[PDB]
Every structure is written in structure tokens, then in C-alpha cells.
Amino acid sequence: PVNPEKLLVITVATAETEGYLRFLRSAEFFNYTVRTLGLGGGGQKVRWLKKEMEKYADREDMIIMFVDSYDVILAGSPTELLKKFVQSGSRLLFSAESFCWPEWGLAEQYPEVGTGKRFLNSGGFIGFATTIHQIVRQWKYKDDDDDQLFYTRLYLDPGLREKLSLNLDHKSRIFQNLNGALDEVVLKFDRNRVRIRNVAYDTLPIVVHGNGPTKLQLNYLGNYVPNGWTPEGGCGFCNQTLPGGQPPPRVFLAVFVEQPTPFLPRFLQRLLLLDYPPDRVTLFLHNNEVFHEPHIADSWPQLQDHFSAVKLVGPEEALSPGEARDMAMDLCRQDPECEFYFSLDADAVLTNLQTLRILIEENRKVIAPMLSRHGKLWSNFWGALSPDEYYARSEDYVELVQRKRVGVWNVPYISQAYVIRGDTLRMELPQRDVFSGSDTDPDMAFCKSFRDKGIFLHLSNQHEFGRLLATSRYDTEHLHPDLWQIFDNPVDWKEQYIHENYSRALEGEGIVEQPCPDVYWFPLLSEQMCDELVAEMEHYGQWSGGRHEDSRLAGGYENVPTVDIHMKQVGYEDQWLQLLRTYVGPMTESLFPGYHTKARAVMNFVVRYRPDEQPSLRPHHDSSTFTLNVALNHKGLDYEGGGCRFLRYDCVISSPRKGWALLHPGRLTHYHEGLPTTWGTRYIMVSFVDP
Amino acid sequence: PVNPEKLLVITVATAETEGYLRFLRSAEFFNYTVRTLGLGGGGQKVRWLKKEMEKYADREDMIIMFVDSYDVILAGSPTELLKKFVQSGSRLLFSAESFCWPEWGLAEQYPEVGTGKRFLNSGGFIGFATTIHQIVRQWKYKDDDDDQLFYTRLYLDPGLREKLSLNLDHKSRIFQNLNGALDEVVLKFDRNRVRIRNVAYDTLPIVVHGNGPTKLQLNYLGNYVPNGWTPEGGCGFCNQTLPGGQPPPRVFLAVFVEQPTPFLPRFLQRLLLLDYPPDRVTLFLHNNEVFHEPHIADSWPQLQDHFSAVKLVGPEEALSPGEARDMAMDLCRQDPECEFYFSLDADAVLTNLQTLRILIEENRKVIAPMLSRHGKLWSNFWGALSPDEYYARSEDYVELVQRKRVGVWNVPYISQAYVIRGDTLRMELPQRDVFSGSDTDPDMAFCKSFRDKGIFLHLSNQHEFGRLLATSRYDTEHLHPDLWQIFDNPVDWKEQYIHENYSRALEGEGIVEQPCPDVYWFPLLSEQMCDELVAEMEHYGQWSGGRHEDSRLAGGYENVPTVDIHMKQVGYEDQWLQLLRTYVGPMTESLFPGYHTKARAVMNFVVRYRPDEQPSLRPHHDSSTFTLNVALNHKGLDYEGGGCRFLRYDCVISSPRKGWALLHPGRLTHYHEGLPTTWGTRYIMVSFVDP
Numbered sequence A, B: 001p002v003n004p005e006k007l008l009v010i011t012v013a014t015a016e017t018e019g020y021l022r023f024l025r026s027a028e029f030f031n032y033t034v035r036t037l038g039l040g041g042g043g044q045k046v047r048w049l050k051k052e053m054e055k056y057a058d059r060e061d062m063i064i065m066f067v068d069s070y071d072v073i074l075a076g077s078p079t080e081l082l083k084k085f086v087q088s089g090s091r092l093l094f095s096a097e098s099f100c101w102p103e104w105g106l107a108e109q110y111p112e113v114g115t116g117k118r119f120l121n122s123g124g125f126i127g128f129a130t131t132i133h134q135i136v137r138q139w140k141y142k143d144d145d146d147d148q149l150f151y152t153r154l155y156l157d158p159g160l161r162e163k164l165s166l167n168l169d170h171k172s173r174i175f176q177n178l179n180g181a182l183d184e185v186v187l188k189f190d191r192n193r194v195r196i197r198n199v200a201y202d203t204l205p206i207v208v209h210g211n212g213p214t215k216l217q218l219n220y221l222g223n224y225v226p227n228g229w230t231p232e233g234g235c236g237f238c239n240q241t242l243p244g245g246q247p248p249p250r251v252f253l254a255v256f257v258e259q260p261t262p263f264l265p266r267f268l269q270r271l272l273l274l275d276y277p278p279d280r281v282t283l284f285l286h287n288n289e290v291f292h293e294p295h296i297a298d299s300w301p302q303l304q305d306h307f308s309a310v311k312l313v314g315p316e317e318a319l320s321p322g323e324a325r326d327m328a329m330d331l332c333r334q335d336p337e338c339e340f341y342f343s344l345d346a347d348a349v350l351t352n353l354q355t356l357r358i359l360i361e362e363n364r365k366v367i368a369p370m371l372s373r374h375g376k377l378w379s380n381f382w383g384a385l386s387p388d389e390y391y392a393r394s395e396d397y398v399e400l401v402q403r404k405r406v407g408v409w410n411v412p413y414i415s416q417a418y419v420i421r422g423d424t425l426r427m428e429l430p431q432r433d434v435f436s437g438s439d440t441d442p443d444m445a446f447c448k449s450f451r452d453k454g455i456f457l458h459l460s461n462q463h464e465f466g467r468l469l470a471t472s473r474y475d476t477e478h479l480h481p482d483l484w485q486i487f488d489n490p491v492d493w494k495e496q497y498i499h500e501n502y503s504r505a506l507e508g509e510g511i512v513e514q515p516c517p518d519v520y521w522f523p524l525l526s527e528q529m530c531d532e533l534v535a536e537m538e539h540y541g542q543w544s545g546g547r548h549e550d551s552r553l554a555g556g557y558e559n560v561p562t563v564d565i566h567m568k569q570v571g572y573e574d575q576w577l578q579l580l581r582t583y584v585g586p587m588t589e590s591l592f593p594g595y596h597t598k599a600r601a602v603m604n605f606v607v608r609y610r611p612d613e614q615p616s617l618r619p620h621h622d623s624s625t626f627t628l629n630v631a632l633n634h635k636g637l638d639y640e641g642g643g644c645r646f647l648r649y650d651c652v653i654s655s656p657r658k659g660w661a662l663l664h665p666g667r668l669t670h671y672h673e674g675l676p677t678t679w680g681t682r683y684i685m686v687s688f689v690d691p
């Protein structure tokens, strides 16, 4: 029964990087004691350990485990570790891996291992101070000379190995080197801790070692082991702060519009609503497209008053996206006042107005909120890569996007929205060629630039932050290209083009009215939706005239005509039909219990009533089960005329409403007539549903 | 200027027949004076005129016109007649015709007439008494010797003709013999008198003579000339009577059913409603068909109590129609109490209950009321014949059937309904072989039997009397063959099978009700219509069961079924569709202004609700614009259950009505449900119109 207090973990680390702190946090979890050597190739490792071991030269009572710091996390307790080391019958136990290195010619000299790791790895070992001192004291070589060779040549001595009883950890009982065993390692879960199991040897290693190229694989494991994320306690390091009286850090806001993006006017307006003192935020905005110049210009006088200072970079600059992200990020670096940098792409839709706070309270170096393309799996981060630096899907990927497991995660790639510490920009990565420099995509060059400096790229799915717009095929050849975004961005299209109280009226609560017997009146369209549909209609500018036939029933003749434009003529039928299924259909089935509509409508047109031409519509029936009648402009302001009238009930809709729609049975019992418009112009949208 | 008072018309007539009285009525019209000789072949004519002329032997001041009586009517005034006779420069003027008779060998001796009638006719002449006496006194021959030869041989004497200045009326200036000139004669009209014009010679004859076979042609003319019927004064001989306190003449009513006839039960019932003292009427009824035995037997206990005496002759007698019309008519002849005989066929529908009075006040020998197959020209009389005794159309035929000209008319043929004087049966036609005797059709043999005795067959269109049923193709292979009579007899089918107050409700006056919002309730079917449709339904006895699909809409499935029988199954769809167009269609267009229905209905079925099987009908919509729902039995007497319910309006038709029908919109807004029937059986007729 060896005392866990006679054990010492030693490691070498020249600075307190993210990995060294990750290692110390796991060593503090199991109550280890770690001696950090040199907080001030590779052969300088042995030289430091050599001097440190002279203190403990004659300490037969002491066990000493030396491990790497950056590429290492711990997964077991010192008690269990000593149990396995004593169980090994070895005075000094080295780690074992799959590859002979450096000299591969020495592979023949190594003893024969039946079905296990056969070669040595000097990244981690454990032994008695006396036995370890006897070895490290043979060092007399230069700092640049390889240490892996020093131990390799000493272990490979059959007599020297026999004398000091030196063995390798062939079956990864204590040391698990990841390089060469990536398929041998899986996660073992518990209530409040996580481990790794070696499915090859059915062992639970204590030390996890991401040697060689398996760095991002260790970052993945390091999100759980030992108490990264637990099935019961959740994440154990996240916040789950700012001084009350004092102000928050000064932020540099950078907005990027590198392609034509939907609902852009809505995004700049959204920038005035972030719950952060605007006197503390400088705005930088790069617009790459002349398509968006009108939108920036509309909102720019407001941003200039809101924020502390603003600066625009326009399309006349001929700035490539990478050069602008250099300039934006480098503008913050050269200002010591810039305490935080925040890059936010136009396709990012932030529905959480405290996003900037949440990410700054998180006290990380570089961090990003999780945004997901609504109803899909595509998000602004990657869980894994390929050997080609192309997207792959990691084991816990779908788990995170669906928020089954939440926390702050070490991931290989982040995009669109992130917050970067000001000091980290100027201290650990002072270069300007962060995005530009090589043919690799700027956003990929970005994450690569931070990985190559050993900086964790964190991702927080601790809360709901926002979503990502689909800009993949945004047709800009319309007067209002957003009016066709009903399929690509259903959520955003609904917020901007559907009446706010539509939802509330649909879920009961008595908003819907019934002015005539079986005529129902509810809010449907928004005032922006009506203004843009009217404008797009008149922009086509080819209204029906004489010799125009319609699907109306008066007497026995369908001769009843109208100054209209059908959706087919402007190529908007597909979109309007989806509005019927998504929005009108549910309403009709609510108002007429027992009826089921698939929203079949072949006749969809927009009507125009002017005192010069067809100011009224004579009484007719409809070639439809039910008919939808949406008014598109204000009565008394855009026109001074009557509305609709149902003769069989002697009931008149005196004043229509700008966004409200009428719903009546068409084929019978509701003989309707359109009252004359006397001044101005009256617009309505008509749909003969269920013919 | 010859005095019209020195003129004498002489004629020979052995009895006051219908023709002699017709002749005297025209002679009294123009204020002629006529001496009737012998009120007590043909040579006895001259013998009588010879003796009469000896009185006036030396009367040079006197003009004497001799004419036939039976085949003659007058058309001019004695003043105008004498004008033309004086204008002739002839002492004795004979009539002229187209045929030489008797001896045709004498045709060569007759003088040559350029373009006119060349031969003599002793049926009418005018001359001086002295000149006429000199001729008639040469008679010494027998009564049987032909008189036409006596004058022919005397006129043909060139010297004798020269001496006495004898001429013929070649151009029909005075005498118009009809035989041979039928196309030369047309009617000339005036305000209060009618004449004839000879289009061959452009003359207006005074005397009209129906010699030879042109007897019915004279009967036709004799209906107008001189004051038979005038465009202003109308008929001048009709009634246009019975003692108040005293009783009317005893009548013998004979009803004939020689073929299966529609609406027979309705006709026997109608016999109890004739406005004639039933204590004065004996009923004879011959039923030739066993098909009608149930109908006679149903009504017979009522007839026996109503009428004075009744007698039936049934199909077990094997009586041919002619033999029964002999027996019936001959039964009255052998009873002197029978003052009038009245034969009435089953196809005759008398809508005027005073028909027997009207025809007896008319004081004719044999007379008939004008009945017409509704909406057609076929009626129970003929205006003319063919040389074959087959139907032809006379000049005034359509005029009479359409009642442009009205009166009592001398026609060649009457059928179905007529009234015959009792004395005429026993006196002028005592024979029994009136209908039977020869292969000619009994009704044709009948009129022929009265024509050959010189009896006028009168016809009265002075009022509206009735109509004639179409028995031509009466399918008797049904439980109630009359239910299929909607096309053949529309008027009668409506009286018996359409609710009495349907018409009144359709012409406003607020009978129709509206128990739920757009559900209208009106009377449609009669209680006899419902009882017979129900009975015919259950008589088919093959109701829908399991695996039965219907055209109802509940949720998204048309699985809603019913214990029904469609009209197609019993072969009644054609008939029910006509009811929809004729009766339902007009009502729907009245209740829903602006709607136009051609009564399109593909689904027409009768429903049955029993407590053992499908007592209710779950909520469904309809595959129809509007739906017709007629209840067919009494609630509370034939069943004790609920009716219809409209869920969207929370309105319930608690109690349906036996003949009333419901009308609601089907496709929407009226989710309906059939309430459970708890006792008995509930029947409804459903029609999904306008799908």
C-alpha cells in the first residue's frame, strides 16, 4: 500500500499556455502535486530534469512521474496510478507507442512484444527517484540533441535494462500515447467524471498523451476528461465577472458583408439593440457589395449617433475579404484601448442581445457563439477535420448542435461570429497576415493561424444565441429580393413579412373578428409586406385591361373582369402558394371546424381600383370554396372609397385594414360586390382557394 | 228596283232535322219568307212543287226561289239576291255545277261555257212564278223518277229554253254548289256576319249548296255563315235553362276503362264532385283491365252511397270495348226515365265540375266538351277527315284548340266525353249496333252511326272543361306505376305528388322558414308522395350494408357510409332529376339571389335509420354545393329519434316535417350530423346537387 503523498509529477513548460493550464486543471482535480520545471531537439528537457533529480538522488521512498505538459491530460487518481506502477514490478516504467523513432534502425534491438506497443516514448514515465536519478545524470549533451535518442540508447542496453529493471507500458495500462492508437481509444462515462478506455487491451489509462499529429483529437478528449463535461453535473469550467458600478471593457465591433446577404436592413437595425454600453463600442463595417450600399446608407446616420466611433470601408476600396479582416482585426491590435475584438458576419442572426456580455464574462482567449442554420445541422463551427483540412463530422458533433450536451468546447474551426481578447492579438499573435497570405480560404487560414500558436478556439453552446441565414442562392434581380425568401429563410421571412399579431390571433384570445355572418377578419400581412408587394406589382407595370377574362360567376356569364396582375405574370405564384399552406391553411381549419385545406389556389392576383378605371366590381360569385381578400394600403390615406359588400346579408365592410384579410365562402350564399373607389388607389390581394 | 216582299223561298223537308233548322235559322237572319213543302229518286219533289205552283200560275209579279233544305245555307239578303237575279236577264235561273248528271251523254247537248260551270243542278233555282209554273206543270211521272232528268231534258231543249229565257248560273253569282268547287270557296269575314267568296269567279254567292259528298264541308261553313261566329259578336247561337225550384233531368253516367290508365284512383274520386244532384244520376262503370280492379274496389263503397244507383261490369265478362259501349248506351235507351246519356272515358280529366250542367243547358242533341292533352294539340275531336276516314286537320282546327275562336261547333268526330239526348237515342237511332258491327274502330263507328242519320255532332269550347291524359306508354310493372308519370303527365303528377303549399311558398308570402343560419325549410312533397316512395323503396328491399362507400367528407376520409338505396338501383334517377330541375331549382335560385342551378345531382339516395342498424350519421361535409334533405315519414309516429344538427352553428332541427325539405350549403361552413333514431324507422331523401 504505497502512500500517494510520496509521488511527484514533474513536467516542463516555458509558459502558461492553454494546454499547460488544461493539464494543471486535471492534475488539481485528482489532488496531484506537480513541479513545473523552467517557467522562464528537446534535449534541454533532460538537462532540467537532471539538475532537479540531484536533490532526490538517494530517495528510495519517492516515486516520480515525468510527463509532457502541453499534449497531456490526466484521467486517474494518484492512488490508482501507484497501484498500477507497483503492479508492474518495474523500477522505472516508460510509455510505449507504435512507432520506433528517431532512429528506426533500432527497431530490431527492441525486445519482442506479442500483441502490444513495442517501442519507447520519452514523453511520459514513472519510477523511483533513485532509479531515475541514475539515468538522468548520464546527460552531458547539448540542449539541441534529441532526448528521445538518449533514453532509447539507454533502454536498448540489455545489461543496463536488466540491472535497473526497466520496462515499457506495452498494453497502455498507465500511459496512453494517442499517435498510432486513435481507433483504440474511446470515452468511458461516469456520473461526475469521464475517462478513456483502451478497447485493444481493455485497460483504463491514467495519462493521456496527444503526441505527434493527434493534437485536435486530444483537444476533443480534453473537453470531457476528467471533469470537462459530466452526464450529471454538466460542464465544470464554464460560467453556467463585470463590476456593477465600473464600466465594461472597450469593444471593437467589426461587421463584414462579403456577399449579397438576405435581410441585411434588419441586421444593421439589430446592431442598435445589443445590451452593451454603446459609449464603449467602436463600429467597423466592411461592405463588399454595391448591392448593399443603399442599405448601409439608410442605417448609417443612426449607427453614427449610437456608437462611440464608426468607420466604413466601401466597395470602391476593392478590398478582398481577407485584406479587410486583416485591416479590421489589425486596427484593434494597434490600439491598446481595444480590450476586445468582435467580428460578426452579416449572415449571423443574433437573437440573444446579451451575446457580447456572455462571451466576455466567459473570460476565454478566443470564443464564439453557436449559430445554426434553422432546422438543419450546418453551423458556424467544425468538430473535426480531414488530413486535407476539409470538413468532417466529429463524434459529439450532432450532440452539440442539438444541445444535448452544452458547455464551452475546444474545436478546430470557428466562423462568422467570435470574440477575441485584445491582449492575445498583440501579444501571442502580433502578425497582420492572419487571414491573407496563402491560397487557403481566409476563414480557414484564420483558425489555422491560431492553432499554430497553440491557442484554443472555444465554442459556447451554453445558451441559445442565434442562427445563420442561407445566402447560397440569393436572387438579387428583384425590386425587393427579400420578398422571395419564404423558402430559404422561413423564420426571418415570417418576422418581417407576417403581421405580428397573426400568431396571437391564431392561438385564440379573440383577436379575429367576424363582421358579416360567415366572413372572418384577421391580421395576416405586415405593413412592410404590403408596401413591398404593391411596389413590386406596380414595378412590373403591366395591368390587365380590356378583353380580360376572370373566374367569377355573375348570372350565367364569367365575363366579370378586373384590373389585376396574377402571381404567375411576375413569377411569384410558388411563393404565394407557400404562404397559403403555411399561414392561411391553419387559420381556415381553425375558423371552420371539420374542414381540411391543402391550400389549393390556381387564381391568385392583385387588384387595383382607381376612379379613372374600374372603380368598382359588380356582384359576383367565386370559383372557389373559400376566398382570401387582403387589403394592401390604408383607407382614407391612399384612397377614399368603399370596400366589400355581401348582398344576401346586407352587411358592408365599411373600412378595410392595411394588413388584415377577409375570409368568406365563395361558391354560394355570399354574393359579394366591390364598392366604388372615389379618390386615389385601392389595392387588394385575392386568392380563390379550393376550387 | 224589285220589291223584296214579292220573293218567296220554297223548300221541301219531311222532318225538322238539324240541317233544315240550320237552313231556317239563316233564312230568318236575313228576314226571308220560306214555304216548307210537305212537313208530313226524288221525283216527289217536283210533284209537291207542281201542286204548290198552281196557286201562283198567273203571278207575273212574283219571284220564287226553290232550294234544298238539308244541304243548304243562305249567305246574302233577299234584296241583294233579287238584284243579281234581275241583273241576269233570265226568266228562270238554274244553279250550275261541274258534273253532268244523271245521263252524262247529254253533256254534248249543253251549250258551251268558256270558263265556268256548264251543267244544270235542280237543287236550287229562282224565277218568275209564271215561268216556273209553266215548267213544273209538265210533271206527270212517278215519285221515284229522277227530277234532275226532268229539268235536264227541259233545259236541253233549244227552242223551249229560248222561249222562256232559261239560263244557268255559270259563274256562281247566286248559287254555289260545293261539289267540284271545294277549292273555289273560302270564307269572307265581316264585323257581325260571315260570307263565302268564290275565288274562281270573284263573286259572293247567296245560296250555299253542299251537294253530293261535300256534306262535312258544308257543316264546316255552317259554323260561321251567316252569323254562326263573328269576329266581334262571337257565336250567335250558343248560351254564352233549368228551373230553379224543379229538379234537373235524370242522367245516366257511363265510365269506361278500356286500357290501363294513369291517375285512375284520382278520377273515380273526382266523380263524387260533379255539381249535379247525385239522386238524379245512375252510374255505369265498365272496367276492362284487372290492373284497375283494386282501384275500383277501393272507391266503389263510396260511389254506391253517393249516386242514385250504380252498376259495375268487370273484366270477368270478357266484354270488348264496343260491346260494353253498346250495353251502356243501350241500357239508357230502354229506360224512358233516362233523359240524358253521358259517356266519360277514364283518360278524360274534367277540371270544370259544372260540365254536365253546361252541356245540358246547351240544349243540343249530341254534344261534347273540348279536352286537350296539356301543352299539345291532340284533342278529343277532329276538324276534318280524309277520303279514307282517317284524321286530317281542318282550316280552323288549331284556332279552336287554342280557343282563339270559341262556340259550339259542328265537327265530324268526337270522342272520350259527350252528352247525348235520351229521346234521340230511342227515336232517331233505336239500333243497338252503334259501336259494334264492323271492323271499323268503335269510336269511329260511333260518329259514323250518327252522321248517317243526319245528326250534328257538336263540340263546345265555350269554356275551359278539362284535359286528356297520355295513356300511350303507361308502364304498369311497378308497385305504384303513377310515380313514374312525371314526364308523361306533368300537371297531374304535380297535383298528386307535390305539396299543395309548395306553390304558395314559392311565390313569397313567408311560408318558407329558416331554422338555422343558411338552412332553408319549405314544403315540397305530399304525404301520398312520401308514402309511395318509401313503399317502393322497401319493396326493392336491397339496402346498402357494409363495404359501402359514399361521397361524404369527414376529416380527410370519405369513409362515411349510410343504409341507403340510390335512385339508379331502382331505376328512378331520371324522374328524380326532373323533380330537381322543375321544382327544387326554382326554389334555390329564389332563396339564394344571384345563384343559378341547372340541378346537377349525381348522388341521389334514400336513407334509413333504425335503432338496430346505423341509428345516426357522424359529422360530415358534402360533395355538393347545396344539399336537399326531405323527410319521408312522421316523427313521433313512425320513429322517435332526432333529426339534423349543424355543429358550427349549434342549431338543431329537433323535429323534421313529413313533406318539408331542408336546404343547406354542403361543401363548407355547415358541418352536419344526424341525430340517433331511438325507436321505429326514419326515412329521408338526400340529393347532393351541384357537385
Ligand SMILES: *[C@@H]1O[C@H](CO)[C@@H](O[C@@H]2O[C@H](CO)[C@@H](O)[C@H](O)[C@H]2NC(C)=O)[C@H](O)[C@H]1NC(C)=O
Residues within 6 Å of the ligand: A500, A501
Ligand atoms: C397587436 O396587438 C397589440 C396589443 O393588443 C397592439 O398594441 C396596441 O397598439 C395600439 C396602437 O395600434 C395602442 O393604442 C395600444 O396602446 C397598444 N396596446 C398595448 C397593450 O400595447 C398592436 O398595435 C397590434 N398590432 C398592430 C399592427 O396593430
Ligand SMILES: *[C@@H]1O[C@H](CO)[C@@H](O[C@@H]2O[C@H](CO)[C@@H](O)[C@H](O)[C@H]2NC(C)=O)[C@H](O)[C@H]1NC(C)=O
Residues within 6 Å of the ligand: B500, B501
Ligand atoms: C297549407 O296551408 C294552409 C293554410 O295556411 C293549411 O291549412 C290549415 O291547416 C291546419 C291543419 O294543418 C288547420 O289547423 C288550419 O285551420 C288551416 N288553416 C286554414 C286557413 O285553412 C294547410 O294545412 C297547409 N297544408 C298542409 C299540408 O299542412
Ligand SMILES: *[C@@H]1O[C@H](CO)[C@@H](O)[C@H](O)[C@H]1NC(C)=O
Residues within 6 Å of the ligand: A029, A030, A031
Ligand atoms: C482533495 O483534497 C481535499 C482536502 O484538502 C478534499 O476535500 C477533496 O475531496 C479532495 N479531492 C479529491 C478528488 O480527492
Ligand SMILES: *[C@@H]1O[C@H](CO)[C@@H](O)[C@H](O)[C@H]1NC(C)=O
Residues within 6 Å of the ligand: B029, B030, B031
Ligand atoms: C228584320 O225585320 C225587323 C223588323 O221586323 C228589323 O228590326 C230587323 O233589323 C230586320 N233584320 C234584318 C237582318 O234585316
Ligand SMILES: O=C(O)CCC(=O)C(=O)O
Residues within 6 Å of the ligand: A552, A617, A620, A629, A643, A644, A645, A672, A673, A674, A675, A686
Ligand atoms: O372586396 C371586393 O372588392 C369584392 C371581392 C370579390 O368578391 C371579388 O373579388 O370578386
Ligand SMILES: O=C(O)CCC(=O)C(=O)O
Residues within 6 Å of the ligand: B552, B617, B620, B629, B643, B644, B645, B672, B673, B674, B675, B686
Ligand atoms: O339530416 C341528416 O341526417 C344529416 C344530413 C347530412 O349531412 C348527410 O346526409 O350526411
Ligand SMILES: [Fe+2]
Residues within 6 Å of the ligand: A544, A549, A550, A551, A562, A564, A605
Ligand atoms: Fe384576373
Ligand SMILES: [Fe+2]
Residues within 6 Å of the ligand: A552, A620, A621, A622, A627, A672
Ligand atoms: Fe370574388
Ligand SMILES: [Fe+2]
Residues within 6 Å of the ligand: B544, B549, B550, B551, B562, B564, B605
Ligand atoms: Fe350511398
Ligand SMILES: [Fe+2]
Residues within 6 Å of the ligand: B552, B620, B621, B622, B627, B672
Ligand atoms: Fe351530407
Ligand SMILES: [Mn+2]
Residues within 6 Å of the ligand: A068, A071, A123, A210, A211, A212
Ligand atoms: Mn508531447
Ligand SMILES: [Mn+2]
Residues within 6 Å of the ligand: B068, B071, B123, B210, B211, B212
Ligand atoms: Mn242537296
